Amino acid sequence: IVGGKVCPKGECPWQVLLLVNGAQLCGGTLINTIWVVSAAHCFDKIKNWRNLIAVLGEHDLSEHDGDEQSRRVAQVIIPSTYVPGTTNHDIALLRLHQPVVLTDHVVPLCLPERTFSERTLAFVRFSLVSGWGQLLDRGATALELMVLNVPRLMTQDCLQQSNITEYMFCAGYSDGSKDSCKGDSGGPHATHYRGTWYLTGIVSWGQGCATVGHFGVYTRVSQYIEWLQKLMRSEPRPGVLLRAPFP
Amino acid sequence: ICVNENGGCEQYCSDHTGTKRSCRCHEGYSLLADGVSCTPTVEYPCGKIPILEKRNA
């Protein structure tokens, strides 16, 4: 995250850190005690699918404070329409091996109904994006979780002000000062409405970040609510990766 | 009704045939008798931040 602030410990309690062989891979969002939403592209190059870990309650990566909860990732579900190394359909649903325990530091973000998200949330101007990604373009990643308030653009307005599909949206700033960045992919774009926060976007990717003339690109979660809900009602299948039809 | 002002619902809204509307709440919340408001029914409902909810409790 470029140009944000430290998320005070416990104020982003749905944020997930994904690790592969102990190394930072991506962010994610907790939506229930065993389900995490992330970005499909995070998994394009995984060799050993059995060394993926999700960490909840993380804040400062330099220390252990006892609020962290680690779980193995049992399933990574990706839409059939996602093509590796691209932006369209950049979403993954992850099933944890064992539920996390909800605590003051570990709380799911609400996955909204489609109608509500389309009719109401999509018109809330500012939303929060968070992660342990780079603090600057071509810079070091953050040790403390960072958060940034970004405004959402209508797609016509994105294209004028800069292919953005109906499965994406733009949000952020075009002056290079404030953006999501490498290391933040998969993390939440969370939208507040009448006292509750909802998942509306997933940090996707682009070439570099905080680039004058360019906005951050987010997966438009409202297009996937039904797809996610059906999968969360399904039984697990052997083998970590699952490609599931979309729609 | 639901397309305007969220139908007055705090959370989810469904239209029915007639001048009818039903609000609903996410799991972990229940609908109050006003037919619009949602109140938590569990300790850690989705989309609420406990350390801030307790700062205002």
Ligand SMILES: Cc1noc(C)c1NC(=O)NCc1cccc(-n2ncc(C(=O)Nc3ccc4nc(N)[nH]c4c3)c2O)c1
């Ligand atoms: C198939 C394939 N062929 O080619 C490639 C390339 C393939 N896929 C993989 O190599 N996948 C592996 C992989 C895993 C994890 C991260 C990454 N990963 N690598 C770079 C970034 C990144 O720049 N992210 C980012 C984020 C926020 C942003 N906000 C703004 N404005 N810009 C932003 C950019 C990222 O996320 C890649």
Ligand SMILES: [Ca+2]
């Ligand atoms: Ca820590």
Ligand SMILES: [Cl-]
């Ligand atoms: Cl496997």
